[PDB]
Amino acid sequence: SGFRKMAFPSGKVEGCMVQVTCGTTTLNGLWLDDVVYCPRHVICTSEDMLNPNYEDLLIRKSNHNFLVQAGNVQLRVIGHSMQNCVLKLKVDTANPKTPKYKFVRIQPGQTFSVLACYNGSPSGVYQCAMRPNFTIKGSFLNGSCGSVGFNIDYDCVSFCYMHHMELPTGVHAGTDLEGNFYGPFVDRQTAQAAGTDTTITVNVLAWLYAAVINGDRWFLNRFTTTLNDFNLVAMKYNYEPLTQDHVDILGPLSAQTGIAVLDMCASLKELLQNGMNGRTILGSALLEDEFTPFDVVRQCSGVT
Amino acid sequence: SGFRKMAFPSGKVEGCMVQVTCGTTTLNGLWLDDVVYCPRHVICTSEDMLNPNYEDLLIRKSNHNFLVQAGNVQLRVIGHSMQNCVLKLKVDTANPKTPKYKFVRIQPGQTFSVLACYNGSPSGVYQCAMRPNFTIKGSFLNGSCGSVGFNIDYDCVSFCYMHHMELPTGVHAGTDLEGNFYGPFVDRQTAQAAGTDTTITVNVLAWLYAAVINGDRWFLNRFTTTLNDFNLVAMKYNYEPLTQDHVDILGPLSAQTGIAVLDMCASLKELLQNGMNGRTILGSALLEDEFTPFDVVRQCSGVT
Numbered sequence: 001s002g003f004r005k006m007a008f009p010s011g012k013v014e015g016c017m018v019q020v021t022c023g024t025t026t027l028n029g030l031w032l033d034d035v036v037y038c039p040r041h042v043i044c045t046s047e048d049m050l051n052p053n054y055e056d057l058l059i060r061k062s063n064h065n066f067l068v069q070a071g072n073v074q075l076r077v078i079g080h081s082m083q084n085c086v087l088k089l090k091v092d093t094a095n096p097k098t099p100k101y102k103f104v105r106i107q108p109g110q111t112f113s114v115l116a117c118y119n120g121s122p123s124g125v126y127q128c129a130m131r132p133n134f135t136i137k138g139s140f141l142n143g144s145c146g147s148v149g150f151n152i153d154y155d156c157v158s159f160c161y162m163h164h165m166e167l168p169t170g171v172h173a174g175t176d177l178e179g180n181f182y183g184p185f186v187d188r189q190t191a192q193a194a195g196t197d198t199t200i201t202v203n204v205l206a207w208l209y210a211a212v213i214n215g216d217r218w219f220l221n222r223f224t225t226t227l228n229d230f231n232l233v234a235m236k237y238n239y240e241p242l243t244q245d246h247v248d249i250l251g252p253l254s255a256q257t258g259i260a261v262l263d264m265c266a267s268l269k270e271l272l273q274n275g276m277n278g279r280t281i282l283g284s285a286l287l288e289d290e291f292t293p294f295d296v297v298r299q300c301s302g303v304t
Numbered sequence: 305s306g307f308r309k310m311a312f313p314s315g316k317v318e319g320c321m322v323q324v325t326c327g328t329t330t331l332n333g334l335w336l337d338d339v340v341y342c343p344r345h346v347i348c349t350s351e352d353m354l355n356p357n358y359e360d361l362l363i364r365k366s367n368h369n370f371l372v373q374a375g376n377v378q379l380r381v382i383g384h385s386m387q388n389c390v391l392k393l394k395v396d397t398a399n400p401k402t403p404k405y406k407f408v409r410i411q412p413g414q415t416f417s418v419l420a421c422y423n424g425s426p427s428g429v430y431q432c433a434m435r436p437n438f439t440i441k442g443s444f445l446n447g448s449c450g451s452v453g454f455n456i457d458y459d460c461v462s463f464c465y466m467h468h469m470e471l472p473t474g475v476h477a478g479t480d481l482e483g484n485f486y487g488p489f490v491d492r493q494t495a496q497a498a499g500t501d502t503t504i505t506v507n508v509l510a511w512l513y514a515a516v517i518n519g520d521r522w523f524l525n526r527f528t529t530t531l532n533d534f535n536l537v538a539m540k541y542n543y544e545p546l547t548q549d550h551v552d553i554l555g556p557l558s559a560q561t562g563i564a565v566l567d568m569c570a571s572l573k574e575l576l577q578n579g580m581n582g583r584t585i586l587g588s589a590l591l592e593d594e595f596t597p598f599d600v601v602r603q604c605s606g607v608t
């Protein structure tokens with residue numbers, strides 16, 4: 001028992017992390033097969049970042065200008081291309097530690113593990129969510145760019161995020177491994193304000209299921225609601241509208257606990273309207289929305 | 305910027321995890337050099353756990369009764385001994401992936417990463433603290449025993465915890481890698497109630513420093529306090545007494561932020577007495593005590 005914000009084991013991704021240096025900019029690269037993926041802003045000075053023309057900056061760069069180091073060993077760059085906001089650096093050596101992997105573009109509300117890296121060296125691992133405003137709330141200092149977000153299905157790492165920038169509000173924006181930003185963000189140092197950080201309702205409900213499973217049940221009430229009634233309250237509290245898709249996704253947790261999804265909705269409605277009254281749920285004084293139904297099932301059943 | 309509950313990268317420890325089976329009991333072992341460490345209760349049936357005589361149960365066990373599997377490969381057990389509450393299984397093969405390592409017995413309030421494992425396969429990594437009552441609040445299902453807690457200093461894994469049992473209250477108890485339980489807990493299925501789960505005051509202050517560093521400053525006030533005055537409030541709120549040792553430990557964060565430790569104490573005193581009033585600090589509605597001053601410095605400076 002017990003319920004923890006749990007990252008995937010990072011070993012498979014540790015084995016992929018390299019240092020990429022272009023001129024005076026050092027950040028992290030992901031080495032899969034004979035390709036190193038990194039943010040294209042590796043080619044920018046701090047000055048460049050104000051109004052970068054990446055195609056033009058990239059013309060002034062050759063294979064030998066990209067310094068790629070895996071541990072203490074230099075990789076030879078035999079090609080480089082720009083795909084959207086990432087650079088793909090072709091190297092002469094396939095990463096021998098390349099895991100089974102996929103590139104996946106995740107939806108808002110989906111969770112993933114970040115391996116925070118500096119100079120291609122892992123510093124730590126934490127779990128986060130693609131926010132509904134397509135930011136993430138990460139922990140990223142200078143040099144952390146090219147750190148990646150991932151999920152693991154048994155032995156297959158699905159890479160879903162590469163870190164690119166911090167908004168002036170200290171939230172984070174990045175790309176999938178095809179170099180496409182999540183949301184409207186650009187790799188330029190400009191006014192980019194995030195939209196409403198709404199709460200991932202389906203994830204809160206999942207976490208309320210996890211709480212019941214793990215003995216935290218004080219918030220279960222005598223009430224039910226409908227999707228429409230619940231959603232009137234959700235809207236009021238900047239919670240994402242709950243869909244029948246979400247209800248269907250919560251079906252297994254509903255089944256396990258014997259609490260109908262709409263009853264858990266009615267409990268969540270009372271928690272929104274009444275607050276927690278100084279009480280906690282799974283050691284949190286606020287409603288946690290960075291567990292997916294899949295995360296709750298995985299953690300509650302012990303998938304490896 | 306941003307501040308996350310961050311585990312150490314787990315790769316070095318993933319490479320140490322094995323499955324140990326004795327009869328019908330399967331749990332996890334830690335393979336370092338030619339020794340596999342596992343909870344001695346691997347030799348117990350569920351029946352045995354009510355009143356186990358480990359020396360007597362162990363007599364009925366031979367090397368060939370301990371089934372040790374690293375991935376899909378069986379290890380040959382050439383010796384077995386009991387050290388306190390762990391078994392040391394000597395195997396004929398040194399773990400080729402043995403990292404630099406130490407066994408350390410941590411103090412209450414100290415944080416570490418847990419690699420939750422089932423059948424010797426990692427399921428996830430999370431950060432936790434040795435509580436002042438020598439429990440941990442983990443996430444451990446049946447089969448998770450022998451999962452380990454660790455810190456990393458660059459390339460040296462300090463193993464500080466091996467998971468052994470869940471108290472009837474769903475908190476966790478375990479040993480160091482010498483098999484000595486943290487606190488008064490025993491590997492027997494009995495009435496074992498945890499003491500007062502007091503808040504790790506020095507860790508809260510560290511996390512308040514992290515909050516200021518990362519822009520969350522609404523709780524800074526116009527007041528200061530003394531250690532004695534603060535401690536009267538601490539006692540009232542089941543917070544650990546703050547010592548001059550703790551003040552000295554917070555010195556670097558004090559220096560970085562220019563907020564005197566006793567001023568941060570006075571801010572923490574007001575937060576205890578006045579609550580958060582529906583406000584959050586680093587996305588928490590309660591005072592987080594599972595970051596050490598070292599964790600805050602490490603994460604705020606980007607140590608790898």
Ligand SMILES: NC(=O)c1ccc(NC(=O)[C@@H]2CCCO2)cc1
Binds near residue numbers: 106107108134182
């Ligand atoms: N304003 C934009 O250019 C914009 C681009 C992409 C998205 N969608 C996403 O990032 C993820 C990807 C899967 C669907 O949701 C939203 C807005």
Ligand SMILES: NC(=O)c1ccc(NC(=O)[C@@H]2CCCO2)cc1
Binds near residue numbers: 409411
């Ligand atoms: N009642 C007991 O037998 C007991 C045993 C050990 C401890 N101390 C610890 O577990 C850690 C280890 C470093 C100091 O604090 C406390 C009580």
